[PDB]
Amino acid sequence: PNFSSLNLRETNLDSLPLVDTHSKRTLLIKTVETRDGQVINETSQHHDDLE
Amino acid sequence: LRRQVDQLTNDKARVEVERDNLAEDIMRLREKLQEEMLQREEAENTLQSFRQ
């Protein structure tokens, strides 16, 4: 009876790294470059950071 | 004829200023519009990199 080899596993306690809370920090730097008031560029830098 | 040329000379000078009004706003526009074609070629190349 050397059981705990089963042990009906241990498909595990699963503190695994499957996280996004770990938050998905959507730093949306919407750089609206206007000239005179007209939009010339919108450099929308989505830094899509997973903390 | 001389009243019509004293008039055409004062007209030439007035109407050169009344075109200098339009063509100075088009000249400011043209210089800003060379700057805008760089802003819209920045939009083409930036948003076409983002299309890729």
mmCIF file with all atom_site columns, N, CA and C in Angstrom, chain A residues 4-29:
data_model
loop_
_atom_site.group_PDB
_atom_site.id
_atom_site.type_symbol
_atom_site.label_atom_id
_atom_site.label_alt_id
_atom_site.label_comp_id
_atom_site.label_asym_id
_atom_site.label_entity_id
_atom_site.label_seq_id
_atom_site.pdbx_PDB_ins_code
_atom_site.Cartn_x
_atom_site.Cartn_y
_atom_site.Cartn_z
_atom_site.occupancy
_atom_site.B_iso_or_equiv
_atom_site.pdbx_formal_charge
_atom_site.auth_seq_id
_atom_site.auth_comp_id
_atom_site.auth_asym_id
_atom_site.auth_atom_id
_atom_site.pdbx_PDB_model_num
ATOM 1  N N  . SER A 1 4  ? -0.349 7.254  -2.537  1.00 0.00 ? 4  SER A N  1
ATOM 2  C CA . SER A 1 4  ? 0.189  8.611  -2.768  1.00 0.00 ? 4  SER A CA 1
ATOM 3  C C  . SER A 1 4  ? 1.223  8.710  -3.908  1.00 0.00 ? 4  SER A C  1
ATOM 4  N N  . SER A 1 5  ? 1.522  7.586  -4.576  1.00 0.00 ? 5  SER A N  1
ATOM 5  C CA . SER A 1 5  ? 1.990  7.566  -5.978  1.00 0.00 ? 5  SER A CA 1
ATOM 6  C C  . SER A 1 5  ? 0.834  7.822  -6.962  1.00 0.00 ? 5  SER A C  1
ATOM 7  N N  . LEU A 1 6  ? -0.336 7.253  -6.643  1.00 0.00 ? 6  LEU A N  1
ATOM 8  C CA . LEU A 1 6  ? -1.663 7.814  -6.913  1.00 0.00 ? 6  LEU A CA 1
ATOM 9  C C  . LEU A 1 6  ? -2.354 7.952  -5.535  1.00 0.00 ? 6  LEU A C  1
ATOM 10 N N  . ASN A 1 7  ? -2.774 9.129  -5.057  1.00 0.00 ? 7  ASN A N  1
ATOM 11 C CA . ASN A 1 7  ? -2.586 10.481 -5.597  1.00 0.00 ? 7  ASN A CA 1
ATOM 12 C C  . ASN A 1 7  ? -3.245 10.730 -6.964  1.00 0.00 ? 7  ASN A C  1
ATOM 13 N N  . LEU A 1 8  ? -4.575 10.818 -6.958  1.00 0.00 ? 8  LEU A N  1
ATOM 14 C CA . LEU A 1 8  ? -5.357 11.180 -8.134  1.00 0.00 ? 8  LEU A CA 1
ATOM 15 C C  . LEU A 1 8  ? -5.122 12.671 -8.368  1.00 0.00 ? 8  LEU A C  1
ATOM 16 N N  . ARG A 1 9  ? -4.174 12.896 -9.276  1.00 0.00 ? 9  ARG A N  1
ATOM 17 C CA . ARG A 1 9  ? -3.189 13.978 -9.215  1.00 0.00 ? 9  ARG A CA 1
ATOM 18 C C  . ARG A 1 9  ? -3.848 15.354 -9.010  1.00 0.00 ? 9  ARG A C  1
ATOM 19 N N  . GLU A 1 10 ? -3.176 16.385 -8.497  1.00 0.00 ? 10 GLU A N  1
ATOM 20 C CA . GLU A 1 10 ? -1.820 16.838 -8.862  1.00 0.00 ? 10 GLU A CA 1
ATOM 21 C C  . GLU A 1 10 ? -1.633 17.079 -10.391 1.00 0.00 ? 10 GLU A C  1
ATOM 22 N N  . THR A 1 11 ? -2.763 17.072 -11.110 1.00 0.00 ? 11 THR A N  1
ATOM 23 C CA . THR A 1 11 ? -3.114 17.965 -12.228 1.00 0.00 ? 11 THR A CA 1
ATOM 24 C C  . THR A 1 11 ? -3.631 19.266 -11.601 1.00 0.00 ? 11 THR A C  1
ATOM 25 N N  . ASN A 1 12 ? -2.650 20.137 -11.357 1.00 0.00 ? 12 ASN A N  1
ATOM 26 C CA . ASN A 1 12 ? -2.110 20.414 -10.019 1.00 0.00 ? 12 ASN A CA 1
ATOM 27 C C  . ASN A 1 12 ? -2.957 21.411 -9.186  1.00 0.00 ? 12 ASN A C  1
ATOM 28 N N  . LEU A 1 13 ? -2.417 21.838 -8.040  1.00 0.00 ? 13 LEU A N  1
ATOM 29 C CA . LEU A 1 13 ? -2.912 22.988 -7.288  1.00 0.00 ? 13 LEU A CA 1
ATOM 30 C C  . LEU A 1 13 ? -2.985 24.256 -8.166  1.00 0.00 ? 13 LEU A C  1
ATOM 31 N N  . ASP A 1 14 ? -2.156 24.328 -9.216  1.00 0.00 ? 14 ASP A N  1
ATOM 32 C CA . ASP A 1 14 ? -2.258 25.262 -10.342 1.00 0.00 ? 14 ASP A CA 1
ATOM 33 C C  . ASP A 1 14 ? -2.459 26.721 -9.911  1.00 0.00 ? 14 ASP A C  1
ATOM 34 N N  . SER A 1 15 ? -1.496 27.172 -9.103  1.00 0.00 ? 15 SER A N  1
ATOM 35 C CA . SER A 1 15 ? -1.027 28.560 -9.070  1.00 0.00 ? 15 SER A CA 1
ATOM 36 C C  . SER A 1 15 ? -0.178 28.905 -10.316 1.00 0.00 ? 15 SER A C  1
ATOM 37 N N  . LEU A 1 16 ? -0.656 28.517 -11.503 1.00 0.00 ? 16 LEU A N  1
ATOM 38 C CA . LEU A 1 16 ? 0.049  28.693 -12.776 1.00 0.00 ? 16 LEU A CA 1
ATOM 39 C C  . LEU A 1 16 ? 0.132  30.183 -13.184 1.00 0.00 ? 16 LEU A C  1
ATOM 40 N N  . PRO A 1 17 ? 1.037  30.557 -14.109 1.00 0.00 ? 17 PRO A N  1
ATOM 41 C CA . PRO A 1 17 ? 1.193  31.940 -14.572 1.00 0.00 ? 17 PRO A CA 1
ATOM 42 C C  . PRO A 1 17 ? 0.151  32.369 -15.634 1.00 0.00 ? 17 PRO A C  1
ATOM 43 N N  . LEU A 1 18 ? -1.047 31.769 -15.662 1.00 0.00 ? 18 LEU A N  1
ATOM 44 C CA . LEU A 1 18 ? -2.108 32.116 -16.623 1.00 0.00 ? 18 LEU A CA 1
ATOM 45 C C  . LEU A 1 18 ? -2.896 33.353 -16.153 1.00 0.00 ? 18 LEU A C  1
ATOM 46 N N  . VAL A 1 19 ? -2.220 34.493 -16.035 1.00 0.00 ? 19 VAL A N  1
ATOM 47 C CA . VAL A 1 19 ? -2.779 35.712 -15.431 1.00 0.00 ? 19 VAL A CA 1
ATOM 48 C C  . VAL A 1 19 ? -2.795 36.875 -16.424 1.00 0.00 ? 19 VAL A C  1
ATOM 49 N N  . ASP A 1 20 ? -3.835 37.712 -16.363 1.00 0.00 ? 20 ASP A N  1
ATOM 50 C CA . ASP A 1 20 ? -3.845 39.063 -16.969 1.00 0.00 ? 20 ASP A CA 1
ATOM 51 C C  . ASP A 1 20 ? -4.429 40.137 -16.024 1.00 0.00 ? 20 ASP A C  1
ATOM 52 N N  . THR A 1 21 ? -4.343 39.902 -14.703 1.00 0.00 ? 21 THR A N  1
ATOM 53 C CA . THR A 1 21 ? -4.774 40.816 -13.624 1.00 0.00 ? 21 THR A CA 1
ATOM 54 C C  . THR A 1 21 ? -3.735 41.079 -12.497 1.00 0.00 ? 21 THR A C  1
ATOM 55 N N  . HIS A 1 22 ? -2.404 40.982 -12.633 1.00 0.00 ? 22 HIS A N  1
ATOM 56 C CA . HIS A 1 22 ? -1.491 40.997 -13.795 1.00 0.00 ? 22 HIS A CA 1
ATOM 57 C C  . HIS A 1 22 ? -1.836 41.999 -14.909 1.00 0.00 ? 22 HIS A C  1
ATOM 58 N N  . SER A 1 23 ? -2.479 43.105 -14.521 1.00 0.00 ? 23 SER A N  1
ATOM 59 C CA . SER A 1 23 ? -3.431 43.840 -15.360 1.00 0.00 ? 23 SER A CA 1
ATOM 60 C C  . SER A 1 23 ? -2.892 44.202 -16.747 1.00 0.00 ? 23 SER A C  1
ATOM 61 N N  . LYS A 1 24 ? -3.749 44.012 -17.761 1.00 0.00 ? 24 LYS A N  1
ATOM 62 C CA . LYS A 1 24 ? -3.641 44.584 -19.116 1.00 0.00 ? 24 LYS A CA 1
ATOM 63 C C  . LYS A 1 24 ? -3.789 46.116 -19.154 1.00 0.00 ? 24 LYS A C  1
ATOM 64 N N  . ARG A 1 25 ? -2.794 46.847 -18.656 1.00 0.00 ? 25 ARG A N  1
ATOM 65 C CA . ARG A 1 25 ? -2.706 48.313 -18.618 1.00 0.00 ? 25 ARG A CA 1
ATOM 66 C C  . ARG A 1 25 ? -2.610 48.880 -20.041 1.00 0.00 ? 25 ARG A C  1
ATOM 67 N N  . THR A 1 26 ? -3.769 49.214 -20.612 1.00 0.00 ? 26 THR A N  1
ATOM 68 C CA . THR A 1 26 ? -3.875 49.930 -21.895 1.00 0.00 ? 26 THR A CA 1
ATOM 69 C C  . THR A 1 26 ? -3.498 51.420 -21.771 1.00 0.00 ? 26 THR A C  1
ATOM 70 N N  . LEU A 1 27 ? -2.199 51.722 -21.678 1.00 0.00 ? 27 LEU A N  1
ATOM 71 C CA . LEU A 1 27 ? -1.686 53.092 -21.807 1.00 0.00 ? 27 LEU A CA 1
ATOM 72 C C  . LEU A 1 27 ? -1.769 53.551 -23.277 1.00 0.00 ? 27 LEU A C  1
ATOM 73 N N  . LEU A 1 28 ? -2.918 54.131 -23.636 1.00 0.00 ? 28 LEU A N  1
ATOM 74 C CA . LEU A 1 28 ? -3.237 54.705 -24.948 1.00 0.00 ? 28 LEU A CA 1
ATOM 75 C C  . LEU A 1 28 ? -2.783 56.176 -25.035 1.00 0.00 ? 28 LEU A C  1
ATOM 76 N N  . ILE A 1 29 ? -1.504 56.434 -25.337 1.00 0.00 ? 29 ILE A N  1
ATOM 77 C CA . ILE A 1 29 ? -1.033 57.812 -25.585 1.00 0.00 ? 29 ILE A CA 1
ATOM 78 C C  . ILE A 1 29 ? -1.500 58.262 -26.978 1.00 0.00 ? 29 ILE A C  1
#
